[PDB]
Nucleic acid binder design. Structure first.
Lengths: 147, 53, 187, 106, 125, 225, 128
RNA sequence: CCGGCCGUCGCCGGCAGUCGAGAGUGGACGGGAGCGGCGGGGGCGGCGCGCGCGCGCGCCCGCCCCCGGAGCCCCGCGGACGCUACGCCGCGACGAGUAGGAGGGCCGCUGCGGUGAGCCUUGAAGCCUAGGGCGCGGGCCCGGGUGGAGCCGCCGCAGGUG
RNA sequence: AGGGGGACGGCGGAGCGAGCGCACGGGGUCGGCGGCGACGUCGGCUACCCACCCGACCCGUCUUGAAACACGGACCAAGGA
């Protein structure tokens, strides 16, 4: 609404702010984010620690599909199957361990973070990580790859 | 003429960018039109499957 | 005319502050009476929080609640939250306890009732006990939101560790100069 | 030369030069700055040492109050106004004192 | 409940009228109109209204009944009263005091009924 | 039953009557003792004066412990040192007067605010009139009027200061609780003097009116009330 | 002796002798309505002595008698009978003011029924 | 400086009808059972007596009144104008202001969704007005004429709004 | 410690035995005091119309500085950011 703004209340006073000495001129100090190297040096280099220059390895075409490897930590691994499957530690047609197909659930690379339950499991994925498998094999599970 | 951020944006052709679209008030009318066209042709070729092949 | 200075006359910690929907407003109309007429500093603090804005009442994550209620000496006590309780998937162990919070998410409510605890709304709590009687009080972390990594010493100073505002994270965005002594200077 | 005379805590000790934390005055904030100084420019400051001595006497006096049961006054009541005392004048009647007439010594 | 359906209708203009720095409400089942809580007939389960009898003699006193759910068609019971002023006021004071209906309205009811009777009995004042 | 709770209520009420009578007895007796105290300590100085002068030597008193300080110059344009020193003495607007413990620290504190004050040695009548007539306590940061006595009793109970006469007694005979008993009193708000203020922007010894007087505050308070 | 108020206390206004606008008298493209002059040369804002006063919140009237008509009531504005009852019980400090827009055929009924209610009317006989 | 008044700020302010100007748990029995207390003053110093054992009066003692009322003449079953809790009340301290910031306007203009069994040819809007009054102000209400068909209050909503 | 004379907790190892008043220089005034005029005179800090006499530069804006011998402003309506 515009029945609440500042101006619809700052109507009487001679200028809506913007003082009377340095008046609200059109564009004092260049259009847009100009300067940068000449008189807004202070701001541009104490609020953006670097804006000028470049860093190498130009890469001429990055189809962002040869690097689509989303991940999931162990401490979030056990939430891909229902709670019921896990309910069975040794019971109701559940032997040593079930299998979780992380690619089937959408995640490729299984990272490692946090503390995983003491219950043997099988993980299927494309990419493991050193801790992500040291913990998995310490628990009593096993790791399996795909394409 | 900044104070905190450094983000720059496209919409400025000094000869106007106004002269391009605002009209999307079609949207409901266009939905009605396309839906009615599907009703029509699905009636015209009756027994053949809706989505065709 | 006295020589006092006036710039600190009015305390900005407002008294009857933003209170806009009738359920919370009515809770305030209830605990105001308790705050007036009961020496229980617990009610003072609870009412003082029923005013705060949501960015000042972050959601109490249930894993935090578990690992802060497990601590010794805190058995069979109602744990009270002024914010809200969002369940965690970092925790597998079914809960064990009894809460009292404004709003509780559906998943967390399912799991608490499965655990066999209870859910207490502030009216239930007040009628249960007119004051803090064996009640632990918590709060979700309030330095949690993102903008805190933006705040602080302005980045580009010699030893900030703050997050600037850039529109991606690519290699070409801010990492040019003032970042690597191969390009003029480093922070 | 900004730190010539200031005095502050010491926090690092190298071979033959110590670090020092001192308060530098700048525009209206006051900074707690840290520096290195070869030990030939520093020296102790009795300011704290006198306080430590009077601490020792305070604690000894407290112990002695424990022993005698009497609560003496602990340190540093500030300087009070003069007491009412008798000035004996046996010896003469006071000297008459009177202004010196002007004279010129160029 | 009695406070929920008060926080909902307190400034949502329903019978409310505000002008010349005053508030009044025109709902039936209401004693002295001004105050907008403890002085509704809609929001409370224990409400007593005092009306001038439509036939120009005595008052009519209506009470909400707890009997039956909130079905407005039959939840307000009406009792005519046509007596001398003193006996009429004694009867209303009875009906409230001895019933524990809503003690905090005894005198508001009494004053309104007496004002009704004054309004009715013909006079040059 | 009801007669018995009536008995207990009458017991409780008589308890307050009991207590109040004991209180008033104590107040009256302590006031009499303070009368005798002031008379003795006055006559003692006269006696010492006579005895020294007869001995043929000179008697010098102990120059006082208590002074009374009034601000006389305005609020506009003051220097910063004197600004904060007046803030510390907690005399702020024009024509405010407070009591002051005398010692080496306070003397030099008053010397740097030299021309803004008129200060001297109050006499016990000049303390009695001040506290009785324009003494307002400072309870809960909410100045109030010293009508009853329970106000003083409650706000100074820990120091055994329960009556008006005892409260004046510390201030005139500065005791080991004077600092709190005198933070208790609001600044005295004196009215502009009657008569005149012979030139006010000049030290007293210059024929003006500022600085040490040692007697004349006794004159000035009778007027500035 | 027609109608009396509940209490008729002496009212002491400071002055509502209308405030006028600085130079509402020289020209006529300026009207008497007040407007605080935000200027840098302006005598009235600058508060020179002997100048048109400004309004300051001190000039208010003590809240025990706001709107207290000098005849001894508070005003109130009425349209018809259904909105005249709302003053039955509270009829000793509030006088009806039938509005500019009623018509005779209803205004006579309003006045006559008010007289039954014993509520003094700020507008007794107006049209005929 | 003393007082009256408005407002702002403070009071963790008081109020679900102010258990203080230190006014001071209770519920039962048992035994043993009160010349009213709860063995703190020559403390000489927050805080220890003198209508005490005089309010009808309590299961046959209408009725532990369970309000034909505890006579709590410092009465939360229990409402005074009270409690439009965004309300009402009590105490104290202060009030300068361009640039600028903010809060509040039952201040204002036009249009919309609601709501006044609203007003209106027995006369709407506007216009004028040495007529009556309100508000500190923004402005508002009422009388008189003049005119000929429309307009306004309240909650929300929107703006090419002063 | 006894108990005569005596410091008495104690509230019983003694002191209520039951009201009325002044009051009151007592927690912000009341009279349980009276006088004059009323059908062409009374009332109207409002409430504005005219006239008087004691006391007081023309606004808006730059400016360190405005009444300025600095600049815009004849007057009214409507539009106007």
């Amino acid at each position: 609404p515009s029945r609440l703004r500042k101006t619809r209340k700052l109507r009487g006073h001679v200028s809506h702010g913007h003082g009377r000495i340095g008046k609200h001129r059109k564009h004092p100090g260049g259009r847009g984010n100009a300067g940068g190297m000449h008189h807004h040096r202070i701001n541009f280099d104490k609020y953006h620690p670097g804006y000028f220059g470049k860093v190498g390895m130009r890469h001429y075409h990055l189809k962002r599909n040869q690097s689509f490897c989303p991940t999931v930590n162990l401490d979030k691994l056990w939430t891909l199957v229902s709670e019921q499957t896990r309910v069975n530690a040794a019971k109701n047609k559940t032997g040593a361990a079930p299998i979780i197909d992380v690619v089937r659930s959408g995640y490729y690379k299984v990272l490692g973070k946090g503390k995983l339950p003491k219950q043997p499991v099988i993980v299927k994925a494309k990419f493991f990580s050193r801790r992500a498998e040291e913990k998995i094999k310490g628990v009593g599970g096993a790791c399996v790859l795909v394409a | 003429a900044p104070s905190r951020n450094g983000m720059i944006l496209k919409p400025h052709f000094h000869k106007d960018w106004q002269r391009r679209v605002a009209t999307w008030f079609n949207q409901p009318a266009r939905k009605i039109r396309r839906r009615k066209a599907r009703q029509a042709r699905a009636r015209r070729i009756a027994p053949r499957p809706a989505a065709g092949p | 005319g006295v020589d006092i200075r006036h710039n600190k006359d009015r305390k900005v910690r407002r008294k009857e502050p933003k209170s806009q929907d009738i359920y919370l407003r009515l809770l305030v109309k209830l605990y105001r009476f308790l705050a007036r007429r009961t020496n229980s500093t617990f009610n003072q603090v609870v009412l003082k929080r029923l005013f705060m804005s949501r960015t000042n009442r972050p959601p109490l994550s249930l894993s935090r609640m578990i690992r802060k209620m497990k601590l010794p000496g805190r058995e069979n006590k109602t744990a009270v939250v002024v914010g809200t309780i969002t369940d965690d998937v970092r925790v597998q162990e079914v809960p064990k306890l009894k809460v009292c919070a404004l709003r509780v998410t559906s998943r967390a409510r399912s799991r608490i009732l499965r655990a066999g605890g209870k859910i207490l709304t502030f009216d239930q709590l007040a009628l249960d006990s007119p004051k803090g009687c064996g009640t632990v009080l918590l709060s979700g972390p309030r330095k949690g939101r993102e903008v805190y990594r933006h705040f602080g010493k302005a980045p580009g100073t010699p030893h900030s560790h703050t997050k600037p505002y850039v529109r991606s994270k690519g290699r070409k965005f801010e990492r040019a100069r003032g970042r690597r002594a191969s390009r003029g200077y480093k922070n | 030369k900004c730190y010539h005379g200031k005095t502050g805590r010491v926090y690092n000790v190298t071979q033959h030069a110590v670090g020092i934390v001192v308060n530098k005055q700048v525009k209206g904030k006051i900074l707690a700055k840290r520096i290195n100084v070869r030990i030939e420019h520093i020296k102790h400051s009795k300011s704290r040492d006198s306080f430590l001595k009077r601490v020792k006497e305070n604690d000894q006096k407290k112990k002695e109050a424990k022993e005698k049961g009497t609560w003496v006054q602990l340190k540093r009541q500030p300087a009070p106004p003069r007491e009412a005392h008798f000035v004996r004048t046996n010896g003469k009647e006071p000297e008459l004192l009177e202004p010196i007439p002007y004279e010129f010594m160029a | 409940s009695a406070h929920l359906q008060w926080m909902v209708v307190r400034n949502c203009s329903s019978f409310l009228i505000k002008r010349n720095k005053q508030t009044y409400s025109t709902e039936p089942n209401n004693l002295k109109a001004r105050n907008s809580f403890r002085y509704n007939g809609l929001i409370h389960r224990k409400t007593v209204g005092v009306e001038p009898a439509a036939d120009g003699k005595g008052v009519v006193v209506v009470m909400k009944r707890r009997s039956g759910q909130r079905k407005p068609a039959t939840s307000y019971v009406r009792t005519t009263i046509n007596k001398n002023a003193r006996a009429t006021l004694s009867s209303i004071r009875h009906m409230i005091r001895k019933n524990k209906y809503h003690p905090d309205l005894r005198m508001a009811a009494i004053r309104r009924a007496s004002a009704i009777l004054r309004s009715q009995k013909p006079v040059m004042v | 039953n009801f007669a018995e709770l009536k008995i207990k209520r009458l017991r409780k009420k008589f308890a307050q009557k009991m207590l109040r009578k004991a209180r008033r007895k104590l107040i009256y007796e302590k006031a009499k003792h303070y009368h005798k105290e002031y008379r003795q300590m006055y006559r003692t100085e006269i006696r010492m004066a006579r005895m020294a002068r007869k001995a043929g030597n000179f008697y010098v008193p102990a120059e006082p412990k208590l002074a009374f300080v009034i601000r006389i110059r305005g609020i506009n344009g003051v220097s910063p040192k004197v600004r904060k020193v007046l803030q510390l003495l907690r005399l702020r607007q024009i024509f405010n007067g407070t009591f002051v413990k005398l010692n080496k620290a306070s003397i030099n504190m008053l010397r740097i605010v030299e021309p803004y004050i008129a200060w001297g040695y109050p006499n016990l009548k000049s303390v009695n009139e001040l506290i009785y007539k324009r003494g307002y306590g400072k309870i809960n940061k909410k100045r109030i009027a010293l009508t009853d006595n329970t106000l003083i009793a409650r706000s100074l109970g820990k120091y055994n200061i329960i009556c008006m006469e005892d409260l004046i007694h510390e201030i005139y005979t500065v005791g080991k609780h004077f600092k709190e008993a005198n933070n208790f009193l609001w600044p005295f708000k004196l009215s502009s003097p009657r008569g005149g203020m012979k030139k006010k922007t000049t030290h007293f010894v210059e024929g003006g009116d500022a600085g040490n007087r040692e007697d004349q505050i006794n004159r000035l308070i009778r007027r500035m009330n | 002796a027609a109608l009396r108020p509940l209490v008729k206390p002496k009212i002491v206004k400071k002055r509502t002798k209308k405030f006028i606008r600085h130079q509402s008298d020289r020209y006529v493209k300026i009207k008497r309505n007040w407007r605080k002059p935000r200027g840098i040369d302006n005598r009235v804002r600058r508060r020179f002595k002997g100048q048109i006063l400004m309004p300051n919140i001190g000039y208010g009237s003590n809240k025990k008698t706001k709107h207290m008509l000098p005849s001894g009531f508070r005003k109130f504005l009425v349209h018809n009978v259904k909105e005249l009852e709302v003053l039955l019980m509270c009829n000793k400090s509030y006088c009806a003011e039938i509005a500019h827009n009623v018509s005779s055929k209803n205004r006579k009924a309003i006045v006559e029924r008010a007289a039954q209610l014993a509520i003094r009317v700020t507008n007794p006989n107006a049209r005929l």
